[PDB]
């Protein structure tokens, strides 16, 4: 089927902890920053 | 009409390792690509529309 076992049953790579960090930082970082920008968006329309 | 299931059973159980949605033939492949294209394209379209409506046109 597909790869099995630790670090293989996930849609992202954990082969590099640093790349992993960057991916996670973007993933969570993006979701957290969204409200802040939607607001800034709503303030800049009027 | 006559019963032609057996033929369809033989065709669909034919060991080619193809997922059921493509197991019928080349037609399946076309239909699929049509459907997926419309969906992906249409979705790309909605993003655009959302971007447009996001701003005031005074």
């Amino acid at each position: 089927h597909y790869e099995e076992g630790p670090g293989k049953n996930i849609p992202f790579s954990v082969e590099n902890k640093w790349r992993l960090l960057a991916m996670m930082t973007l993933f969570f970082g993006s979701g957290f920053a969204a409200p802040f920008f939607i607001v800034r968006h709503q303030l800049l329309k009027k | 009409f006559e019963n032609r299931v057996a033929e369809k059973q033989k065709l669909f159980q034919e060991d080619n390792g193809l997922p059921v949605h493509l197991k019928g033939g080349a037609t399946d492949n076309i239909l699929y690509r049509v459907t997926m294209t419309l969906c992906l394209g249409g979705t790309l379209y909605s993003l655009y529309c959302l971007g447009w409506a996001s701003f005031p046109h005074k």
Partner: protein, 514 residues
Amino acid sequence: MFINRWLFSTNHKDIGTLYLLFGAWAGMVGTALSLLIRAELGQPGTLLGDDQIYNVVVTAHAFVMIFFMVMPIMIGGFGNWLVPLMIGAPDMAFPRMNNMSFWLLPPSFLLLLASSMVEAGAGTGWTVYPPLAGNLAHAGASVDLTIFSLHLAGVSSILGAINFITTIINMKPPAMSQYQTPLFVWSVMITAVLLLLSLPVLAAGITMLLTDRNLNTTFFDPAGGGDPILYQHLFWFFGHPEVYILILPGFGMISHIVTYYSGKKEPFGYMGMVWAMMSIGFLGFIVWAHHMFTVGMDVDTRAYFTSATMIIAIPTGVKVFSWLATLHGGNIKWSPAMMWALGFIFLFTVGGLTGIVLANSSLDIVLHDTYYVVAHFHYVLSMGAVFAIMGGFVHWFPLFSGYTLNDTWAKIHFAIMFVGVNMTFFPQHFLGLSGMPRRYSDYPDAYTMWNTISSMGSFISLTAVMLMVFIIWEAFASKREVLTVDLTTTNLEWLNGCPPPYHTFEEPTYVNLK
């Protein structure tokens, strides 16, 4: 192959994984929203200067936390990953439809983020009451986008409910009766029956709002003979079951966390835990009007609802004590998951009791629509669901990934979060008694002290979430693979290794009928 697995899945574990990912992401959004809410109330005066924006934020925060974080994580994540394993089932009954239930959420979420992007957003409150929600007070796409997001999230859950009920009723070992299934499974099945029954009414409700706004219907428009109150009846007839739907799965995880870390092989009074959940589910359908005490209802009606609403505490009590009874005489393992489960038991009780205060129409007249209500549900729901979710998560993380967390960091995460949420929500009890209303971007000067504190507490919690992220990175970064797990004789889901193979139970379990 990547796309085949992650976009075309039919695997219950993989799907539950996407749900866990989606929910974690949603959680970050919901949190940013909350931190915004408290930033505005952080000091007297306005911060945003735009109160329509504040209203949009408060509305989004709720929708996100409820529909995109809690339900996805609980029924979607833990629900999919665990239920099949716990009954020795090969996968869910309709493993394909199950993938759509998942994929309907990002579109549903997109629709929500759109409603806030276009026009002035929907600053109507997660209850979206007409006429404020109507085409005149809230003209434009915003409310319509919001109504749609709910339709999507709704079909996703209604389908997901059909799946779990079918799976649980039909896919257990031939010898296993319903009363031989774990509690988490019971919790999920019940939650699902609630979803099956309640969402369609909400659906009917918001459809009527949609037509009032776009097809000139007058369901909630007096000018046509309509009635805004009708909407509230329909919305709440769903809204109450929904609050129970948000905690039931957490009840299931708590029973399991407590039995496990108590070093016990079974929960105290199983049949009593089952009866509890069933009852709660049933009663949760006949108490909705307690959200409408101030709309001016007949005194008799208000008496009935006050009474019905209180009875719920009986079965709920039985669960509380059974958890304490499960702790009774156990070999206590002070694990991070146990800590979350303990925090949950205390906090949930607190919130539940204030809920009993509010069940009284009389006192509610003064408490309704004040921060007392906001403190009640942030204790039961926010602290309750989140705490259970955090417990279930650290408990089963190794099972899902095959790696272990650094127990010390996790205990620190629990500590910071505990301080953070109470310092954030306890003072709100005061604000509510003294009369500070909900949904206010600013408050009369007397309420300054408590609003300042609560907002400071909100930050501590932030520090806890940021830390939680980092902790997950550390599990995956260090890579400590699991070897041995205790009590597997009574925790079937741990039996196929960590993480278990893609297809499990290819060969069913053997269970004698005797």
